[PDB]
């Protein structure tokens, strides 16, 4: 059974077309541990602050994934997205 967001065309595509598109390469159960939750995150709040935070998770998670400096020098796409993302 689907917990939320049951067939809405672009469940498990949107964040793959943005984050892993260049940041995180391909196939990491590590990264997927947040790429799962992004699918549910689309109905978090409102279409902005939902999807926004769906990008948030992975940007923090990229640290354990292999990053040391990808917060601050990347906040230009999160904080200068939305002062929120």
From Swiss-Prot:
Subcellular location: Host cytoplasm, Host perinuclear region; Host cytoplasm; Host endoplasmic reticulum
Residue ranges of domain RdRp Nsp7 cofactor in the record: 3-85
Effect of residue 77 to V: In strain: Isolate Shanghai QXC1
Function statement: Forms a hexadecamer with nsp8 (8 subunits of each) that may participate in viral replication by acting as a primase. Alternatively, may synthesize substantially longer products than oligonucleotide primers.
Subunit structure: Interacts with nsp8 and nsp12 to form the replication-transcription complex (RTC): nsp12, nsp7, two subunits of nsp8, and up to two subunits of nsp13. Eight copies of nsp7 and eight copies of nsp8 assemble to form a heterohexadecamer dsRNA-encircling ring structure.
Record protein name field: Non-structural protein 7
Species name: Severe acute respiratory syndrome coronavirus (SARS-CoV)
Span of the entire protein shown here: 3837 to 3919 of 7073
């Amino acid at each position: 059974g689907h917990s939320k967001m049951s067939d809405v065309k672009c469940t498990s595509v949107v964040l793959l077309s943005v984050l892993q598109q260049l940041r995180v390469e391909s196939s990491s159960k590590l990264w997927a541990q947040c790429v799962q939750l992004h699918n549910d995150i689309l109905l978090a709040k409102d279409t902005t602050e939902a999807f926004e935070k769906m990008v948030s998770l992975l940007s923090v998670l990229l640290s354990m994934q292999g990053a040391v400096d990808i917060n601050r020098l990347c906040e230009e796409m999160l904080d200068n997205r939305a002062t929120l993302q």
